[PDB]
Each structure stands twice: as C-alpha cells, then as structure tokens.
Amino acid sequence: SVPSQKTYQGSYGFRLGFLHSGTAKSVTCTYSPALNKMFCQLAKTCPVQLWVDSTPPPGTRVRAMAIYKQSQHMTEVVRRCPHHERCSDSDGLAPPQHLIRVEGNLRVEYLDDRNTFRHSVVVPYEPPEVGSDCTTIHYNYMCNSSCMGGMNRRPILTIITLEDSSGNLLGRNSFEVRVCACPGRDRRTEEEN
Amino acid sequence: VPSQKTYQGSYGFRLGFLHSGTAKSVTCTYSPALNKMFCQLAKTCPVQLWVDSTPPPGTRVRAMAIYKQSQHMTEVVRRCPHHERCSDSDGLAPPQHLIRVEGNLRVEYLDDRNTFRHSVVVPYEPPEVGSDCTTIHYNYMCNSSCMGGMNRRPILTIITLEDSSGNLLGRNSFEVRVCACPGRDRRTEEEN
Amino acid sequence: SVPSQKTYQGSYGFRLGFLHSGTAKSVTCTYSPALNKMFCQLAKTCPVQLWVDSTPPPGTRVRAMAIYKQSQHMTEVVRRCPHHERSDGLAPPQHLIRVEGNLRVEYLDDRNTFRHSVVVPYEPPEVGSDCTTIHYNYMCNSSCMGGMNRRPILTIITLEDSSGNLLGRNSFEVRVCACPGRDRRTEEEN
Amino acid sequence: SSVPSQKTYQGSYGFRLGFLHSGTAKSVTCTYSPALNKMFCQLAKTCPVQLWVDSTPPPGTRVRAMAIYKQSQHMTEVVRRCPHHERCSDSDGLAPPQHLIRVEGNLRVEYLDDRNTFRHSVVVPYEPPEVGSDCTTIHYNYMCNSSCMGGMNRRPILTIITLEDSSGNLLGRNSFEVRVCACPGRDRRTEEENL
Numbered sequence A: 001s002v003p004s005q006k007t008y009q010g011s012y013g014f015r016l017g018f019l020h021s022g023t024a025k026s027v028t029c030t031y032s033p034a035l036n037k038m039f040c041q042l043a044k045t046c047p048v049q050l051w052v053d054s055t056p057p058p059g060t061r062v063r064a065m066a067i068y069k070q071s072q073h074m075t076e077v078v079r080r081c082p083h084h085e086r087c088s089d090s091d092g093l094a095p096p097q098h099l100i101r102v103e104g105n106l107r108v109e110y111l112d113d114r115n116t117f118r119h120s121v122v123v124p125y126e127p128p129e130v131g132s133d134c135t136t137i138h139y140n141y142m143c144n145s146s147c148m149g150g151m152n153r154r155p156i157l158t159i160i161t162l163e164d165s166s167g168n169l170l171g172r173n174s175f176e177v178r179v180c181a182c183p184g185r186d187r188r189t190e191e192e193n
Numbered sequence B: 001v002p003s004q005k006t007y008q009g010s011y012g013f014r015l016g017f018l019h020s021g022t023a024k025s026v027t028c029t030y031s032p033a034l035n036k037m038f039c040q041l042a043k044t045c046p047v048q049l050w051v052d053s054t055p056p057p058g059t060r061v062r063a064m065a066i067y068k069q070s071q072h073m074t075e076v077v078r079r080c081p082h083h084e085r086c087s088d089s090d091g092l093a094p095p096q097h098l099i100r101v102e103g104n105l106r107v108e109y110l111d112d113r114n115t116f117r118h119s120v121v122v123p124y125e126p127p128e129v130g131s132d133c134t135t136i137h138y139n140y141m142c143n144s145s146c147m148g149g150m151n152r153r154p155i156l157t158i159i160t161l162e163d164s165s166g167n168l169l170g171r172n173s174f175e176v177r178v179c180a181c182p183g184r185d186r187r188t189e190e191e192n
Numbered sequence C: 001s002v003p004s005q006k007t008y009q010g011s012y013g014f015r016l017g018f019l020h021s022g023t024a025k026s027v028t029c030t031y032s033p034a035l036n037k038m039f040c041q042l043a044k045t046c047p048v049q050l051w052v053d054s055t056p057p058p059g060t061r062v063r064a065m066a067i068y069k070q071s072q073h074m075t076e077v078v079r080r081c082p083h084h085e086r087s088d089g090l091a092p093p094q095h096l097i098r099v100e101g102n103l104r105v106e107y108l109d110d111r112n113t114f115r116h117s118v119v120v121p122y123e124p125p126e127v128g129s130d131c132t133t134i135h136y137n138y139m140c141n142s143s144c145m146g147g148m149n150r151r152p153i154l155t156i157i158t159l160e161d162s163s164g165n166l167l168g169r170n171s172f173e174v175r176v177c178a179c180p181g182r183d184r185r186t187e188e189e190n
Numbered sequence D: 001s002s003v004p005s006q007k008t009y010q011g012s013y014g015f016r017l018g019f020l021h022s023g024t025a026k027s028v029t030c031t032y033s034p035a036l037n038k039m040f041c042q043l044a045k046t047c048p049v050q051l052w053v054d055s056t057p058p059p060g061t062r063v064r065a066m067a068i069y070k071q072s073q074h075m076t077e078v079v080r081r082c083p084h085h086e087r088c089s090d091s092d093g094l095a096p097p098q099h100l101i102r103v104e105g106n107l108r109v110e111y112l113d114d115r116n117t118f119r120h121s122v123v124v125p126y127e128p129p130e131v132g133s134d135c136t137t138i139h140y141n142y143m144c145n146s147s148c149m150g151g152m153n154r155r156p157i158l159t160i161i162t163l164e165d166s167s168g169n170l171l172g173r174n175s176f177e178v179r180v181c182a183c184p185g186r187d188r189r190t191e192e193e194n195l
C-alpha cells in the first residue's frame, strides 16, 4: 500500500516554495517550476520553503519521504546504494541507509517504519524567521540518481507532509528530485524538452 | 436526516446577517444570493434572530450542522481529529462539536442519544433596548478544507426555535464555508 | 463624518453619462445637464453610464452611495422611511439605492460610518459601445415623511480597485418623484 | 559601484535591439520612441523586443532582462512589483510574484533572485531567426504601472538586455527606458512634444 502522494493544502493552506536560484555553473540546488523538479548535488544544502496561510500550533511536525515515481517501481523502498551506505559520512543522527537528511537541526528524528520499511526524516515546524514569510528546511540527498545498486537512474518524488503532534495529517505536497553532479546543466537540458 | 424545511411559524421567525461586504479585513460575510455565510476558524459569526412577536418564556435556540450533499447527509458533522485534540477550548463545548456559542454562560451542548448528531442550545433573549433583533455569536471550530473532517464538503447550519418542552416553533437554515479569506471566497463564488 | 463628493476623473478618465430622454409625460427617468440632477420614479430603472478613456484593471468595482446635499443634514445617513423599509432578496430593506439585473451586486453597512452603499464589478463596454450602463433603483420618494422628507440628496459613484483604493469619483443630484418630466421642466424654468 | 552595468556593448556578434514601428494609435498596447529610446507599454500586455546580430551566437547562448532605476539617487534600489500587484492572482505558474519583467509564450523561461544583489531577472535561450525573419523576437510583460504607489512610484526605469554564453560570460548589452501606463500612444505623443 504505497504511501499517498496526492496534494492537500488542508486547514493551514500548506504549499512548498523554492528559491529562484537559476541554472548558473556554480548552483548546488535549483528548482524547475515547469517540471516541478528539484536538481541538487550529493550531500549539498537543498532549501525547501514551507508556506502556510495560518500558523500551525507548536508541536506540528514536517516529514520528508522518498518514493519511486514510476508505477512499476513504486512498492520498492528508496534507500542509499551499498557504496554510499559504507562512506564514513554519517553525521551521528541519520541512519546510514537514509537517502534524505536534514542539516542544521539538532531536533531531527529519523524513522524506519515498522510495517512499510519506508524511511522518513521529521523536524518540528517553526514559524518564519524575522524577514521571511516562509519556513526553510535544509535537506541533503545522500545518493546520486545515477547510483548503480540504488536509485539507478529511476526518478523519485519527495513527499513533504505536515502533521500535528498526534500524527494527524494536516497537509501534503510533492516534487520530483534528481541528485546529479551538474544541477544547472541538467535542469537546462531537461527543460529544452 | 433532520428537517431543513424553512418555517417562520407563529412568531414570524427569520434570520438576519450583518451587511459586511467582501473587504480583505472582513472575518465573517453573508451572501444573500447563495444564502451562504463565509467565516474564519474560531472567529465570531453573528446570526440575528428576527421575530414579529416575542416567543413564550423558556423558548430555546438550537444550532446543528448537516452535510449539504445527499450522499454525505447521513454522516454526523464533527471536528477533524487534529482540531478535536487542539487547545481551542472554552471549558463548555465538547471537543468534537463543530458549532460553539461564545459569550453565553447558559449555553448547553447535546450529543443526541439516538441520531448521535451534535447541537448547541441557548435561551432565547428578546432584543436589547434600541435593537429589533437578537444576535447569537457562533464559532465554527474546523475549516471546510480540514483533512479528516468536513474535507471540502459543504455544510448547512439549521437554526430551530423551540419551546421549553422542545416543541418546534420556527426553523431556518444557511450554507457555511469556514475559510482563511471569507471576503475573497465570497467574491469568487458570486462571480459564478 | 462625511464622505468626499469631490469630482475626480483620475487615471482612467472616469465620467458619468445619462440618456437624453427629454421631459415627455411618459418618461420614468430624465437627467438635467443644467442642474446635474436625475429626476426618476420610485423603484423604476435609472440607467447611469460609466465612461473611461482607458479600461480599468480586472477586479475594479463601482460603488453608489447617497448623502444629503445640504450642509446641516450631511452627517445624517440616507435611508428609507419606516413604511418603505417594511422583495428583491439581495438588498437590505433600509438601503435607498439598489442595482437591478446584476446577480454579483454586494451591499455594505459600513462598520464605522453606518453609511449604506451598493457595489457591482466593473464590466468594460461591449466591442462597438463607448460606455458601461448600471441600472439603479431608488426605493424611497424625495417626499417620504420620516425618510428623506423633501431634503435633496446626491448619489456619489466611486470607481475602486479590488482592494477598495479610489480610482475615480463623480456625483449627481437625485429627485425621486411621481412626475420626473414635469418636475425637471418646472425646476429648469427657474 | 554595486549597481549592474548599463553601458552599451554590441561586442563580438554585433548585438543590437530593434522594436516594431507600431505608431501611437488609440488601440496600441506597446509603442517604442526612437527619439527617447523609450518603450511605452500597458501592464501585462505583449512587449516585442527584437534581437539583431551580425553573426549567430553559439547554441546555449542566453538572453537576460533586468530592470534598474534610471536616476542615480535610486539606482541601488531593487526594482520590484508593489505589494498590491504581487498579491494579484493572474500568475502563469513560472514567474515569481515579485518580478516586474516576465517572458510570455516560452516554457524554457528561467527566473533569478540573485543571492547577493537581490536583483530580479528573467532568462530565455537565444534562438536564431526563423526561415524568412531577420531578427529574434522576445515577448516581455511588465507587471506593475510606473505610477504604482509602493513600487516604482513614478520613478523612471531602464530595461537592460544582456546576451550571455552558456557559462554566463557577457557577449553583448543594450538598454531602453520603459514607462508602463494606461495609454502608451497618448503618453508617447505627450513626451515627444517636449522638444
């Protein structure tokens, strides 16, 4: 029973935003609005903005989970390849198997689901900082889309769910992700289609 | 399904609403064209009671929500799990109840023993010196959009006037949308 | 305290136009350019034309509001008499000015001034036509005891953006009477 | 200074801008004054800008548009939409709501909030002229009026069109003044009668 990817703004008007970073040679993470697709480098900072019409209560949580986009691969759990799992890159909080990490958050929590065996990373919701109208989470993707014995060129979605302290669903959104050496070049190439 | 049929009855019982318009700042606004209240979560929703003649002593006013659509009508309207557990409690209303009355310490809440439907009842008070109607302040404690609650399904509120024994004196109804921007949503919905 | 009646064509060159109806016995509404005054019958169609040099943006709105013309009555809210206050399903019973034939009409009791107004979306002229026509109804006679009671009123037509920011304003005096043709002719002979 | 350069540069490919000879008739939604080097256009309406080159730039060449204030005392201020227009819904799903300059009819359009200057710009791939045609046309939309309180607020702006290679190296730059107004025909005629 593949986890739901259906968009749901729900009670708090929950949407995702991304920086308008462009496709310049130097860019480590870039979002294509035309493709609803993030292009990012391995282990590099991937800002995802949370936008709400109304402030969820304290103890609201934000979960990230990867699934395969293709229907024939969707029941397979998205995990790191053997090679990246054994690279000495653990930050002491993230399980070595987990594709998606959060950086800069000491309250981050990781789940190996007892029944689905799917991986996810959860942080407390904090309201926007002074200056901002959105909340930024810094994701790291710890395997390349190309990795043999991992994703192996199969496209993935990230599903961002907003939940209350009791685990009740408040909101859900999703975006395609490609983890690659040259996000700028790969975004430009994929858009020319 | 409880009756929604309009009935002015013996005392000429009608509902009135503030003529608030659709300015960005408006927290609650009524569309006469749609017979539909647009209001924000937990915010004051004035409903006016108009009578041609003063109902008898011990007259009561009940509010009850039903789903508007025929395929959802037998389902009891309640809060979503999330809002049921949230600290938005006045100490009087059951946590499950969508419709509260604010500013009335004589308010009474019912879980109907047989229908399991929720309702909130207040004593009828005649208009204040100067005024021609009685205002009740309703709060809707879930958004129309709430996942695992109304979940975008439209609802009606039914306002019934009853005597002290619970005999029907009068009934009216209006559609409700609980939303972030009532002004914008009323304007948008009227454009159709 | 009192809403502004100062004419303002503003950015879009906003002016009012009226049908050149004359003063024949049969006429239900007639405008005097010499007096800038509409003479109309109770509840009858009052065409008001909106003329613009440039098309205002989508979500532009048109508000109508009545005030008393005389300085000693200007702070009093214009409303219907008790009798007429006692059919259309949309307009509050107290409101003097209604719009007919528009399902998108919106009515306001101002929270702070207690002044009444009616607002419709601006629609551009049809291709070929030069103006937009709104059909107003006045729901009380100028003569009504316990209402306007023979006091003259102005209608103020404001053009506003979707946020309620003023784009344009015009005004015209209104007399609601049994015989607009006769009353216009009589008032002009002065 | 901080301010991005507005200096004209035809550079290696002989890069210059052209505009339609549209005139000042009542109906005209965008009109260019050669005497003033100034585009007069209506909000959200199609603004053709022609790219002329002496020699075809390589594939992966890009064309960026950016607005700056013309006056030296306002030049370090970022040109953006007013609060009012930023919140208006008419959005194409691609352009940030804050961006004054959009490109229409181009699904390969890319928008930049510069991480360090905070300046906005819109980029499209350079395509050579079609069989028959002698120049490349881009369709710009300006999403705020020159008059807008809490935006440009009657301050004149320049649009800077830069030609860059795939690596972001500058190939060419040109500029033109822009007025976004209700009546471009009338406003061009009025502004030209001054001299």
Ligand SMILES: C#Cc1cccc(/N=C2/NC(=O)/C(=C/C(=O)O)S2)c1
Residues within 6 Å of the ligand: C057, C058, C059, C161, C162, D043, D044, D084, D085, D087, D088, D089, D090
């Ligand atoms: C033609 C045209 C066009 C396109 C986009 C924006 C615009 N100005 C606007 N001004 C407003 O206040 C409205 C707000 C809203 O988008 O509803 S849109 C005009």
Ligand SMILES: [Zn+2]
Residues within 6 Å of the ligand: A080, A081, A083, A084, A142, A143, A144, A147, A150
């Ligand atoms: Zn790997």
Ligand SMILES: [Zn+2]
Residues within 6 Å of the ligand: A011, B079, B080, B082, B083, B084, B141, B142, B143, B146, B149
């Ligand atoms: Zn809820």
Ligand SMILES: [Zn+2]
Residues within 6 Å of the ligand: C080, C081, C083, C084, C139, C140, C141, C144, C147
């Ligand atoms: Zn009257």
Ligand SMILES: [Zn+2]
Residues within 6 Å of the ligand: D081, D082, D084, D085, D143, D144, D145, D148, D151
């Ligand atoms: Zn603006």
